[PDB]
């Protein structure tokens with residue numbers, strides 16, 4: 274079945290999807306992130322970070338304290354299942370992860386850890 278998704282986050286604080294479904298016959302799953310807009314990474318950086326729904330708050334809280342030079346993730350954060358780089362306008366990055374990290378029945382969120390962004394640049398991810 275399809276095992277990749279293209280995602281944009283723009284300068285208007287939107288990802289172009291808020292809901293990803295990962296087909297359970299996929300062995301790996303790829304997210305391709307790009308960033309329409311004009312603003313640089315240090316003011317309008319976005320990443321795509323996956324964790325369980327329950328872990329999202331703590332990843333976001335620790336990430337935002339970690340600084341730009343950490344790409345806004347706490348180093349060795351074991352809650353992070355997969356993520357792209359933090360990217361600014363005009364840049365792109367992909368991540369491919371093993372679908373065996375995901376479990377059916379569990380709720381996942383993807384989100385941006387750039388400070389303050391996750392209230393807007395987030396959505397759900399389901400293994401179906």
Ligand SMILES: [Cu+2]
Pocket residue numbers: 274275276298299
């Ligand atoms: Cu397939």
Ligand SMILES: [Cu+2]
Pocket residue numbers: 282317318319320385387390394
């Ligand atoms: Cu952002």
